[PDB]
Chains A and B, each alone.
Chain A
Amino acid sequence: IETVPVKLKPGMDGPKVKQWPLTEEKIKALVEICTEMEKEGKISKIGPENPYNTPVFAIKKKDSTKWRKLVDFRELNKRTQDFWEVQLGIPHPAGLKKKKSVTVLDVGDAYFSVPLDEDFRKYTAFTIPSINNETPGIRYQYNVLPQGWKGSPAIFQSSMTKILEPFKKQNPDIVIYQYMDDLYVGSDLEIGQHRTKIEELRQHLLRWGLTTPYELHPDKWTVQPIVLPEKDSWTVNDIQKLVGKLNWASQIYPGIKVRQLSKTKALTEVIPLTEEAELELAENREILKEPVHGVYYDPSKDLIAEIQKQGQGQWTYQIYQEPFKNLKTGKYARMRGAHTNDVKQLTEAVQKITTESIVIWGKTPKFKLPIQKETWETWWTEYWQATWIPEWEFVNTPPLVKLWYQ
């Protein structure tokens, strides 16, 4: 099979990203994985004439007791795919977000059966690192379509469309969308009917040579409503926090009636709700009930996700592209009795938000994560169960607005 030629964006040079230091455990797992890969043709050792590099990591995908290699191809994706969303794009179905159940099948192993353009392999270099700078580091490049690269499913989509065509014929109501290594498969069936259909698709893929080794429900109540507290008795400081919350929402919603509620008592003194005050409160709860105006998804600008830690395992998030023009807000919360911690919750939340973002727009967002950069860079792999990796950056000034999104 001939190779699809890959000529990346003019003037752009290849990735030159440093490799993170790793635990001995993970270095050993990487050496094992890569020795089998070299033995099978998928990667080859390289020399000093190849200056590029692309980070690698060891994770455990889908709660397995066996390791898995994860290549961070973000830099190479920006440097090639920004002309391979154009030349070889995969169109994103606008109806996948509307099916009542959506399952995510991993179909990554597929790419390993297709060779990669020889002139391109240089740019898939990666270093398995040594401890204490003791040995040079082991240098590989790919000879087959690598998982994690956005060009692989692009190149493979002709094959994927052909393999899937008999199923798509037998099931014309089902939606199938390929994001990098996963088919997202949506249906309006009962959950058991849906599971039956998903296993039929598994066996259809299998009897065509695609090995494949947890459902979403995107009737998920898009941008969530904020509610004012409801109380039998209203104190001075209750009126104060209510006023302050309602003034912050003047940035998102325009028509919050304020003055009737703004009219040197002690904080704990209970002030009775005026007729004009309860009038303004009702008008404001109503003007909050409805969704926002002018909020439309622009497909030229990037998506932005912000997360806030709420305590007791709760986390709120907003996804937007213009401030206060939220495209989607929601709330994540880990298991009630499970042994979890902050960074575990942050990682599962980032993953959940990214999957939602794929289902809805076919793009991932850039995260503004509430966490020390070096902490995240050290611990994010320990719970990362996904094969893609979103862009991110770190917040260090806190929201003195914390409750306003709870």
Chain B
Amino acid sequence: SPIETVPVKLKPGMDGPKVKQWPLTEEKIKALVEICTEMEKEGKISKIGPENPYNTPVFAIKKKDSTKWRKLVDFRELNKRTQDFWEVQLGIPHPAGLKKKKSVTVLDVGDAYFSVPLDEDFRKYTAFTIPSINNETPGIRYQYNVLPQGWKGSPAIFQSSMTKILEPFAAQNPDIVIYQYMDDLYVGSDLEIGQHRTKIEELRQHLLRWGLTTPDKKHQKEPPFLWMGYELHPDKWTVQPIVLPEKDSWTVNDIQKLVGKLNWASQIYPGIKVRQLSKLLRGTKALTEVIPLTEEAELELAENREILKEPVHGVYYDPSKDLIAEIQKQGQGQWTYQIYQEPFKNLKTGKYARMRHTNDVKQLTEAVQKITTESIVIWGKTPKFKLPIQKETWETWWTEYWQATWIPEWEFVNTPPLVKLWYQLEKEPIVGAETFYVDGAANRETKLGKAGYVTNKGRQKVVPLTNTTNQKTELQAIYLALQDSGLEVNIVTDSQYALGIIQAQPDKSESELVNQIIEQLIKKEKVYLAWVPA
């Protein structure tokens, strides 16, 4: 209230709210006048009526009853008209990144907004009105002197005010760490508990001298702290308990929520999968349609139910002991990783899924990238990696891949399933091997096609195909040539699509034809694919 206000202007070229006050019951009016004089007594709202053309609606309701009503203001029309602000806490600190302090205290700040002043020349826009009997008698008109409840500027201005009030106490107390969140302070120190409590009292007094009230009893409940869907214990952190429901039918909404809770749990519970269980969601965006659970998704839900039966915790961060991430392959495009500093307790866990004909080494590389980003956010450095791939495998892939790639400091781990390259085409043609001039073709309308080959030895095959596409038959021609050749074969296609897919050296695919082609290319010994214009 001696706090320096922040200057606030309206969006350029707008006036203030001139909204209708749709009257309500007289009892609501009485409760509003009670709370309005009690709020004027504290100087939060002063009553000036005559020359203010602005107005904003006011309602009354009871939700959490101390035998009292409560007043609220629909500030939508005003919020739409005030300038933008610097945004907010744009996300949450992750518990894995906090550093253990010998004590932490939580301080809920009281009527936080109502005890921070509003810029003077702006107050006229907060003006509101109380009617007496449906305009038979005039009503009383007020404006705000403080940050109104639910106005666009209140959070960021309150953050700025609180930061400024804190920095004198912060500078006379460098042994103490204060973190801000919407209404709370979190104070951590490595001071002996008596000293820590003396400092917490000093801070409370400091804040009280600026109009900010604070829990006078024993402060917010001792650890563990239930905060932002987490559980924070003096030496560990975990997620709040996650209970998956058992039901007969599932709407798209229920699977959305189940996939969500499983993702949340995946940050500390190692092994959770969401692949076959959100394959159900891609169908459409229809909200209440009931989806039949597949058999894969049923096993997945059970498998998560089991790996979730026993609780798991994570530790906090020690900056003196180095940072390690270790990666494992799971299955159908699914990977998991653990980030730790020591071998029995993770800082956190996590999973990577593929989005879009794919390749295991490229996928591992994308996993290393996702982890590297997260590490930089949470801790501000990058981990040393433990990867199930060999230096020659990786050196071979990245020296040949068409994109540039950064390969951080990594050490190989011999936990299967290892990541390998399963075949490599020849760079030059093969002398002594048969040459297959393959081609294929479909018809866009009849959905009938052919695939075939002509070889230099005079061998020729043509196989008919139903329900195919030009690209499908283009790959089927290559598959025919692989099926009918020896262990060394040159293949010649005129299909850019085919040569692209196959030259990408994929390992698996959501297409059975390419899988059979892959199993052939593994079975063969030397295969030189080559391309000519159509």
Contacts and interface: CB of A to CB of B under 8 A. Distances in A.
A398 B496 CA distance: 12
Interface in A213-230: none
Contacts of B533: 243-244, 247
A237 B118 CA distance: 80
B86 A50 contact: yes
B49 to A, nearest CB: 29
Interface stretch (B253-261, B378-386, B444-452, B517-525): B378-386
A136 B90 CA distance: 9
A131 B84 CA distance: 25
B532 A243 contact: yes
Given A48-B159, A345-B404, A370-B404, A134 B532 contact: no
Given A51-B84, A268-B430, A135 B380 contact: no
Given A243-B533, A268-B430, A371-B403, A27 B492 contact: no
Given A132-B377, A309-B402, A49 B85 contact: yes
Given A136-B159, A266-B490, A372 B403 contact: yes
A265 B6 CA distance: 83
Most buried by B among A21, A132, A378: A132
B369 interface: yes
A23 B402 contact: no
Contacts of B179: 134-135
Main secondary structure of the interface of A (DSSP, over half): mixed
B86 A51 contact: yes
B380 A27 contact: yes
Given A265-B456, A375-B406, A244 B532 contact: yes
B87 A372 contact: no
A386 interface: no
B462 interface: no
Given A136-B180, A139-B86, A374-B369, A47 B437 contact: no
A369 B98 CA distance: 37
Interface string B459-494: 000000000000000000000000000000010100
Interface string B71-94: 000000000000111110111111
Interface string A108-152: 000000000000000000000001111110010000000000000
A396 B366 CA distance: 13
Contacts of B492: 240, 267
Nearest to A269: B456
A379 B89 CA distance: 26
Interface in A343-373: 343, 345-346, 369-372
A224 B434 CA distance: 39
A400 interface: yes
A341 interface: yes
Interface in B358-390: 365-366, 369-370, 372-373, 376-382
Contacts of B7: 49
A332 B179 CA distance: 49
Nearest to B456: A266
B289 to A, nearest CB: 34
Contacts of B243: none
Nearest to A19: B90
A267 B377 contact: no
Interface residues of B, number: 69
B512 to A, nearest CB: 24
B8 interface: yes
Contacts of B92: 133
Given A136-B159, A343-B404, A370-B402, A378 B373 contact: yes
Most buried by B among A53, A134, A139, A395: A134
A272 interface: no
A237 B531 CA distance: 9
A51 B378 contact: no
B184 to A, nearest CB: 14
B532 to A, nearest CB: 5
A341 B406 contact: yes
A251 interface: no
Most buried by A among B403, B432, B454: B403
Interface of B: 6-9, 83-87, 89-94, 97-98, 153, 156-157, 159-160, 163, 179-180, 365-366, 369-370, 372-373, 376-382, 398-400, 402-407, 429-432, 434-435, 437, 454-456, 490, 492, 496, 499-500, 503-504, 528, 530-533
Interface of A: 18, 21-25, 27, 47-51, 53, 131-136, 139, 235, 237, 240, 243-244, 247, 264-268, 308-309, 311, 341-343, 345-346, 369-372, 374-375, 378-379, 395-396, 398-400, 402
10 contacts: A21-B373, A24-B380, A235-B429, A240-B532, A265-B456, A374-B369, A374-B373, A375-B369, A378-B376, A402-B402
Given A343-B404, A378-B373, 18 more contacts: A21-B377, A22-B376, A22-B380, A23-B380, A27-B380, A48-B159, A51-B85, A133-B92, A133-B93, A135-B180, A237-B429, A240-B530, A244-B532, A267-B528, A343-B405, A343-B406, A371-B404, A396-B403
